[PDB]
């Protein structure tokens, strides 16, 4: 049910309930009318942690375009002790500032899902071996590229670029000299995009990188002279990191020859 | 005139009129400040109908960034009887929910323009032959790709891809072997983009598809060895479906040879 | 500190201060939740001047996503008399419309920074020689392409396209016939993009043009047979015009041979 705005013209004794309802309706209406890139309903715009789990930057969109922002006023840590899911808890509370009451949102971390909270959504997956807490991939859309898992992806992509250069130099150029120029062209394009993306994390998206890698993969398959059936992977806005990892692994497997 | 926010500091007897005016001003200000992709003022984000005209999904932005959403609470049909324009009517009405009055927007369908309504904008064009109601192209910007007319476009594009493959295999490769590799590359790129777009309708735009088709067209014209004058068509954000149809028709005409 | 919404449930004598605070908090919350392309915090969406400095169109986002709009109700001129910085001043004032008080934002132009104003941000740089006021490049992000400085950039880009065609026709094609096809392809792509961008200014961004020019530059460097070290320039969302000018100048310098 889409309620538009509240109806004031009737006239009634101004109580707190009607004002709170009006504010809530206005907020809901304007949040619904808002737009996100690629018409997404939720995503992560920034999420970084210290490398005990300590949160430095947290900014994301929950389901139905709910905005969550983390103030640096209080620490956000869990400090586990001994497949470990990580959950985010949002509880509202009343605080007073310079003589005026307000409504605040308090963030917390828990090991499992909890009740009695406004929101409880899993945001990360962690696996520990001898107390190391190796990060793990979790399926969630992200809008920007400044995610804590992107370091491993960048290292793997640099290794893939080096492997691609070696593969083109050694055997691919000798067999098919015609497509070698286009392959070098696309490799340089990917390298330039990676160099730009590493320096600027908040102004990039995974779709461009996935498109470049997929294009490089398809170009090799077309002239590979192997079986005519080519395996195609489609990008998914729900699991982008998984698709990037699978594409990189397949590219490395084909490049190792 | 850009009114920013209302001025409360004067102090006055709190009547319903001032509260309604404040809410309206806040809504107008925040709607004006909003942003849409490619800096558009209106567009269609989702519009699907059953295949009597029955509406299943309706979501679009009117002029001056006005947001219209269709609740599935009530049916939305016209049921014509015997170039048939279709119009959308918006009338506001007062409803009460759990003891609180609200303002609701009611949607309706009419054969022609009507007065006495908040909005009356034509959204579709229909032509019937022996009571069939064949869909017709209407000029209106759309943000996503889930429009009811995209099925015919997808079928035509698949046929165009097959025709392009046949044309490249038969005559184009034999005459110009140099550009054949690039042509096959671009054809595969278009095929991959089409495969992704068909599965994911809400996360795609017509501009990418138009760019790919136009690029394929230009590549053929450059090495076609025919008259040096090449006909170039520019994408228009006001009539995207028309441009797509014209480009596809021209590509098919050139491919039939 | 992220204050969410105001707390009304306590109940208190309804004064103007609490209503103004509630409106301000709602506006701040919804402005913070808003999103801009490439996750930018500020930018210019439209800025045109008559060619005394007379402002015709002014629309931009200030820092922290503050929206500024210029009404055509009053003139906006400076009329200097004799490195001249230009500043924008925003002062709020109370106006009354049809019996209802409101809050208005008044825009002004000044030679230097001023105090006692809500905002004072430099937006343009001008240099005069014998009273001519030649426009100068200032570093500021812009979202669309309808900026007053784009005319010179478009002229330089057309000259660059002509120079690139001449360079490819004369010497580059004779030495390396393999990459000539790809170079002509990319030149035609850039020409088509420029033709589209000139007609449609409000629906384009500098990133696409920069990517096309950089791609053309890299393709030439790869097969240039000169020193293997290639100079790469990265696009910056903070100084896009500067990067475009530097890339165009370097391309012209390399093309002159």
Numbering used by the authors:
A (entry chain C), B (entry chain B), C (entry chain A): 1 to 51, 58 to 88, 94 to 268
What do the authors say?
Francisella tularensis, a Tier 1 select agent of bioterrorism, contains a type VI secretion system (T6SS) encoded within the Francisella pathogenicity island (FPI), which is critical for its pathogenesis. Among the 18 proteins encoded by FPI is IglD, which is essential to Francisella’s intracellular growth and virulence, but neither its location within T6SS nor its functional role has been established. Here, we present the cryoEM structure of IglD from Francisella novicida and show that the Francisella IglD forms a homotrimer that is structurally homologous to the T6SS baseplate protein TssK in Escherichia coli. Each IglD monomer consists of an N-terminal β-sandwich domain, a 4-helix bundle domain, and a flexible C-terminal domain.
